[PDB]
Amino acid sequence: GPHMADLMADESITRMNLAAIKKIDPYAKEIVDSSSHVAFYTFNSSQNEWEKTDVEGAFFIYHRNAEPFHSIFINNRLNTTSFVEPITGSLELQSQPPFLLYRNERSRIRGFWFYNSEECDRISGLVNGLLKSK
């Protein structure tokens, strides 16, 4: 009676994802990880509150065999807009469950919200490796 979902995913799905990616970033060749749904949040210290940004999209990490070595992209589904940013090796990360927190230039605070906390964990692990490996 009970049935478990297949852990392995079809290769066709992976190919399709990379196809959409190329549409915005011609130099994205491989996908490292993808989160079904991720949103960008910023913190304003003056007010002591969190403000949601206009970027709500599927989050993908792209790998390339040329500079930049690694870059992160969010496909904004609601606004049909592309937002890209390169990965630097000076960023410091922190994990406050279930929301991921990181620090940015000029003492600013920004974080990422994921549909599932575990899903966020996997993505974060990748970034940590890049920071310590190059």
């Binding site: 002591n48 969190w50 929301f99 620090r103 003492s107 605070i109 974080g111």
Partner: protein
């Protein structure tokens, strides 16, 4: 425009409702600012 119900039985989906992030104690904010500052 829509008015949320005062009493709720089960958690239902509501399009347009922003999630509420948890706020840490003041110490967290201060610590971050200092580390970045030199």
């Amino acid at each position: 425009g829509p008015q949320d119900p005062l009493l709720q039985q089960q958690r239902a989906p509501f399009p347009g409702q922003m999630p509420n992030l948890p706020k840490p104690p003041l110490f967290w904010q201060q610590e971050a600012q200092k580390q970045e500052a030199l």
